[PDB]
């Protein structure tokens, strides 16, 4: 039986998001990609470097906004701009979200030597696609 | 036991409301000690106070 | 909380009793009608048995 990226059926009490509820074979069919860049296009370079950066940014944001992320990050690159789009919860005070946005944008801009912007969308609770 | 666990319960011939709790209301017999769980020491004091 | 023990008494007795015990807060709509105009036989479950030995049905031939 295939296991990769499959949330398995339970008793009907497990809420899954739209991203989580779709196995890999639905990628490009029912669900899109969580990062968009040109490195994996034919004739394009630096796919290895874009991949390492993506893995770090996901770990960095998970631990920088602990317990606040309500879904996977969407990473967008245009030119040298890096846009991080995150769906977050509404538990942290707004002052703390502004601190972490200013802190994270600056720290990541100096780390990866590119203009980095963070776009936060807040939701009252994790959006549930179905109960598996 | 019920008597020894509460030091404010005093087995005395004047505390008739406590003594009534160890006598059957329908037959007037004094319960044997296993009925209520009182130790032998307090059951004797209850039987003497009741009498 | 009507009882579903249909083989224990009748719907009237089971309803009448649970009303007395306070289990049923209100009497059902039919209870007062049954009480005023009851059936000839109270509808109590009975198990039908086959006859044995010398037992015969009491139905007579019409001549």
């Amino acid at each position: 039986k295939n296991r990769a990226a499959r949330v398995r059926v339970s008793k009907g009490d497990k809420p899954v998001t739209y991203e989580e509820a779709h196995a890999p074979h639905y990628i490009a069919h029912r669900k899109g990609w969580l990062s968009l860049h040109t490195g994996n296009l034919d004739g394009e370079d630096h796919a290895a470097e874009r991949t390492v950066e993506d893995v770090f940014l996901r770990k960095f944001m998970w631990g920088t906004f602990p317990g606040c992320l309500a879904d996977q990050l969407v990473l967008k690159r245009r030119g040298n701009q890096l846009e991080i789009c995150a769906v977050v919860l509404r538990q942290l005070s707004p002052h703390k979200y502004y601190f972490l946005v200013g802190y994270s944008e600056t720290l990541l801009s100096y780390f990866y030597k590119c203009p980095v912007r963070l776009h936060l969308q807040t939701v009252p609770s994790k959006v549930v696609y179905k109960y598996l | 036991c019920p008597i020894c666990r509460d030091h404010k319960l005093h087995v005395d011939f004047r505390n008739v409301k406590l003594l009534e709790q160890f006598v059957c209301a329908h037959t007037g017999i004094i319960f044997y000690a296993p009925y209520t769980g009182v130790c032998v020491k307090q059951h004797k004091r209850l039987t003497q106070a009741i009498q | 909380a009507g009882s579903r023990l249909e083989t224990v008494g009748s719907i009237f007795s089971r309803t009448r009793d649970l009303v007395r015990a306070g289990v049923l807060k209100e009497k059902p709509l039919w209870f007062d009608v049954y009480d005023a105009f009851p059936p000839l036989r109270e509808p109590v479950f009975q198990r039908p048995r086959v006859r044995y030995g010398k037992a015969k049905a009491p139905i007579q031939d019409i001549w």
Binding site: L100 | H26, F31 | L5, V8, D17, G22
Partner: protein
């Protein structure tokens, strides 16, 4: 390496090993399982080992109307914070370790006799707060399946009652024990019997019946006699509201047959009013405590017969040798008439 690190959910799912061939068929004799602890519970965003005070994250942004600047706690001031966090963490663990003492049933490890509380409120705002639930038997039953082999299920017997004559019982089945409790107790309220009680404390007459192979002999008793019956009969009688009765169980002692037999006998008893109506005579009670005073307990609602009930010089009633042997002082048992706790 930073890139080899995983999330807490990944780490706990592995370490706990809740899913695995060992969990499948209880293949291992295991008792104390590791329990996942939430390591982010008491953690504050912005707090670190170095004791830095980040304005707007872990300390207030503005102080005295002016914006605070980056600051760092002193070594001593940071020791207190660390110690205070450890004490708070130990307190959290301490409380979790502390557990409430369960009131036991018929025995310390048995489920029988334990209360399950009132049945759950029905969908249409229906409530059963007046009803109490008692467990009578919890059995682990096993069936053999093609794939999974020996599969484990729970069979529960529960009794419900309000203490005022309305009581019932139901079986519950489920893989989990708490689900079996829910099914049995919620179903039992839909199968309630009404039990007639003499003076709201005892049965109307001696009841002797057999249900399958279980024999139950019950005797009407006066006030103060208590419940001197099989422990399960005691439990059921408290739910019905019977205070004084003697019962003896003979033959197969099966909890489900005992419960079903008990409820059959108690539902099928003739009251004094029914006896008077059936025979159109007065039912007169004679009490030795009241001497020769005749106490009419029930009178027929319809006409009253004029012809005395025939007086058969000798009744052709079947007697129980145990009852006769006791009345003649020939019954010797070290276990009979023993001193017991109030029931």
């Amino acid at each position: 390496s930073f890139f080899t690190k995983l999330t807490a959910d990944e780490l706990w799912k592995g370490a706990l090993a809740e899913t695995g061939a060992g969990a499948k068929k209880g293949r291992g004799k295991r008792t104390k399982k590791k329990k996942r602890k939430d390591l982010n519970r008491g953690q504050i965003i912005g707090e670190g080992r170095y004791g830095f005070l980040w304005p707007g994250l872990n300390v207030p942004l503005m102080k005295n109307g002016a914006v605070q600047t980056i600051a760092q706690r002193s070594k001593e001031e940071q020791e207190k914070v660390e110690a205070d966090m450890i004490q708070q963490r130990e307190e959290w663990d301490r409380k979790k370790k502390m557990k409430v003492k369960r009131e036991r049933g018929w025995s310390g490890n048995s489920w029988g006799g334990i209360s399950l509380g009132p049945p759950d409120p029905g969908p249409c705002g229906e409530t059963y707060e007046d009803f109490d639930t008692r467990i009578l038997e919890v059995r682990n039953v096993f069936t053999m399946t093609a794939k999974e082999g020996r599969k484990k299920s729970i069979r529960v017997l529960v009794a419900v009652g309000n203490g005022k004559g309305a009581a019932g019982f139901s079986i519950g089945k489920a893989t989990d024990r708490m689900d079996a409790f829910r099914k049995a107790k919620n179903r039992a309220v839909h199968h309630l019997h009404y039990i007639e009680r003499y003076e709201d404390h005892t049965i109307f007459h001696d009841i002797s019946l057999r249900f399958k192979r279980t024999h139950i002999k019950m005797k009407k008793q006066p006030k103060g006699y208590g419940l001197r019956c099989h422990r399960a009969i005691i439990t059921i009688c408290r739910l019905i509201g019977i205070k004084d009765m003697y019962a003896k169980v003979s033959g197969s002692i099966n909890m489900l047959s005992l419960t079903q037999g008990l409820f059959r006998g108690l539902s099928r008893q003739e009251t004094h009013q029914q006896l008077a109506d059936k025979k159109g005579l007065h039912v007169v009670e004679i009490r030795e405590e009241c001497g020769p005073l005749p106490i009419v307990v029930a009178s027929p609602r319809g006409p009253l017969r004029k012809d005395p009930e025939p007086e058969d010089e000798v009744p052709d009633v079947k007697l129980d040798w145990e009852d006769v042997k006791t009345a003649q002082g020939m019954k010797r048992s070290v276990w009979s008439n023993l001193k017991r706790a109030a029931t």
